[PDB]
Design a binder for this molecule. Sequence first.
Ligand SMILES: O=C(O)CCCCCNC(=O)CCCP(=O)(O)Oc1ccc([N+](=O)[O-])cc1
Ligand SMILES: [Zn+2]
Ligand SMILES: [Zn+2]
Ligand SMILES: [Zn+2]
Ligand SMILES: [Zn+2]
Ligand SMILES: [Zn+2]
Ligand SMILES: [Zn+2]
Ligand SMILES: [Zn+2]
Lengths: 222, 219
Amino acid sequence: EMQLQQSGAELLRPGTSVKLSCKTSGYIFTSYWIHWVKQRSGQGLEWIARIYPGTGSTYYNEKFKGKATLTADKSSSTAYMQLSTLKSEDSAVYFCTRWGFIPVREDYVMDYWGQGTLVTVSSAKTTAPSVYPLAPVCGDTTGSSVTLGCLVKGYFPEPVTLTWNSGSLSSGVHTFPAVLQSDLYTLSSSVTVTSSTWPSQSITCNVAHPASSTKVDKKIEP
Amino acid sequence: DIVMTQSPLTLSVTIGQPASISCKSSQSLLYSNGKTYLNWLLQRPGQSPKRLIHLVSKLDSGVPDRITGSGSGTDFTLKISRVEAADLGVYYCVQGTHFPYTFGGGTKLEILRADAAPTVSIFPPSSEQLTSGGASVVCFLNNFYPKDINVKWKIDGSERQNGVLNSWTDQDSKDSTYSMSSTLTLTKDEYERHNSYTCEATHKTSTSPIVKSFNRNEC
Ligand SMILES: O=C(O)CCCCCNC(=O)CCCP(=O)(O)Oc1ccc([N+](=O)[O-])cc1
Ligand SMILES: [Zn+2]
Ligand SMILES: [Zn+2]
Ligand SMILES: [Zn+2]
Ligand SMILES: [Zn+2]
Ligand SMILES: [Zn+2]
Ligand SMILES: [Zn+2]
Ligand SMILES: [Zn+2]
């Protein structure tokens, strides 16, 4: 199993720098080129650079010379990308990939990608979210089924982790993308169950915000 | 740098039907060695990109042969002979003939399904929130299709435009529908001054607005 695992989300102050890591396993690290790709506002991909771990040989997209520096630790099968003097345009998701093009063969093997690392360039303070349970009254859909909710608001930065009944409840769950407004995010999730389950069986909203070490569980009481 | 132009930006196709996406380049992608380094990638919702085709028409291992690629020079096309639910996502063509490698803007493939009327739920502020001096009224509009919808909030008959936060999910892989959440936030004091809170939606599935409301009072 070829696996590329990238480091966690980063909140970075303007003008400073970060080092992102891409840990690989399952193949001979020194024999394949590792490329780094950038994605802004979803549809908006850009090729940054590539490195051949076996030799340390690198090639950069002109735009990123001076912005990105690629290195690779053979002893740990880990590739790194340092980004210097961060600015607004640097807030993006960065992917590492064992692309697979084999120059000598003029052909390709399978491409494997890391999960991506989100970088947020901001001077804003880390703020813990407030979690509110949404028991219906009108948003009960009447009989048959009922939908409950969970409102997570006033946090910074992304991400926040939301599950229902510790992940034991995933069917009929809709988690909405966070929206930033006034330097703080708001996220919400709904879960629809049968009139029979709730309130008979307890439904709990689990929320985690790594940045502020927050972890809360809100039970939806009638 | 080479500019890659993709069209259409979005395509809505029914399962079982064919789809074709175009990609045009500002310079010929034919390399001096006679090979053409044009690739096609698919980025599924919440996933990393994945390559489908390399060298214009060659399929990567494990990719269904329902997908085919063709073209040359500055003109290329990706074709899906018969669309399946798993094809939902954004497709990108990316050239590697000229340095630096450049991507097209992407084409979002949406699964066209039968209209579905929204299931709307409304929630008054939680006691916990009111304690903090804030008041948010939430409205969930779940599983509708088409994605086009307009929601307005009305308090005591008058439209409220300030303090509204909307969020939509991407198209669901399970049923091909969309969901939306609308949160209206006020101060606890103002919330306790009004009676009726209405979430009103405008959607293809109805000639009149879809309404959901509650009246706050005592007892
Ligand atoms: O035109 C010029 O100016 C000089 C041309 C020199 C370029 C040399 N070209 C090559 O070695 C071929 C590489 C083709 P490729 O498919 O690997 O390119 C890529 C590589 C990574 C990508 N990704 O998204 O990760 C996307 C495309
Ligand atoms: Zn050949
Ligand atoms: Zn091949
Ligand atoms: Zn060239
Ligand atoms: Zn040339
Ligand atoms: Zn009034
Ligand atoms: Zn009045
Ligand atoms: Zn009023």
